């Protein structure tokens, strides 16, 4: 179906403890495929998925050089951000960047991204049009002017409409056995009495890929949003994800409740009940 490629940068300053750590992780959908860490013994782009390993030595050289130069770039950015925000040199600060492309089922660009954040706050983001910028404040507006003057948007768009979609297309073909395979959740309902009058119904989804899923409880066919306890989707460690949704129900009313499951690996949404 639809697929995404994203690279994630984190640059973290640590005054008194050496130069800022720079890390890059790259993903196709929910699959990590490459990493770089400047704190590695001999830092380089490293394969994290079997399907990327068949890129020749030139791929790795070029990708490694990109990250090594990025290490320097983001260290400068950190120094610059400090000046733009009148901050002291004694504090730790973080720059994050996300960028990448989404493609549709036919592999055409759906949309591009390139967003930066400073200390967890929006800094600057390429707009959806891939030709203008949104700056979060007067500090980011300085970077915007520099980037406007240097035609950075035009170079992002060249990448996003070309290399981004083409490499993602190649990765999807090479990893087609996994990247283009959806695993539907394994699902069950468990029953946990809290007290005499109340019981917990917990609806589980295990073993699914990708992470996107919807799990909801109904009572007499009515959504129980404000009553449902919903945990964050969590990795199992085998590429798959887990989720549950719980409700507290009155004793003897269990059959009024149904759990509803939507996942791209399921032809039709599932309906479950407690099965005593």
């Amino acid at each position: 179906g639809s697929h995404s490629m994203r690279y994630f940068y984190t640059a973290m300053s640590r005054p008194g403890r050496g130069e800022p750590r720079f890390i890059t992780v790259g993903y196709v959908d929910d699959t990590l495929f490459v990493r770089f860490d400047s704190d590695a013994t001999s830092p380089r782009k490293e394969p994290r998925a079997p399907w990327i390993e068949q890129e020749g030595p030139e791929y790795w050289d070029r990708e490694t050089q990109i990250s090594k130069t990025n290490t320097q770039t983001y260290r400068e950015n950190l120094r610059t951000a400090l000046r733009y925000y009148n901050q002291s040199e004694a504090g730790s600060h973080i720059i994050q960047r996300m960028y990448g492309c989404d493609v549709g089922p036919d592999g055409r660009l759906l949309r591009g991204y390139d967003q930066d954040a400073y200390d967890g706050k929006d800094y600057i983001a390429l707009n959806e049009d891939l030709s203008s910028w949104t700056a979060a404040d007067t500090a980011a507006q300085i970077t915007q002017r520099k980037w406007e003057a240097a035609r950075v948007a035009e170079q992002d768009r060249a990448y996003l409409e070309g290399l981004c979609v083409e490499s993602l297309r190649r990765y999807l073909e090479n990893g087609k056995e996994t990247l283009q395979r959806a695993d539907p959740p394994k699902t069950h309902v468990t029953h946990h009495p809290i007290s005499d009058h109340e019981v917990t119904l917990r609806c589980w989804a295990l073993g699914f890929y990708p992470a996107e899923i919807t799990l909801t409880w109904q009572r007499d066919g009515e959504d129980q949003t404000q009553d449902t306890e919903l945990v964050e989707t969590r990795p199992a460690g085998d590429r798959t994800f887990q989720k549950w949704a719980a409700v507290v129900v009155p004793s003897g009313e269990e059959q009024r409740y149904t759990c509803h499951v939507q996942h791209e690996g399921l032809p039709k949404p599932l309906t479950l009940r407690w099965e005593p």
Partner: peptide
Amino acid sequence: EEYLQAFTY
């Protein structure tokens, strides 16, 4: 594949 975005803040 990445690209080198070389322009700083």
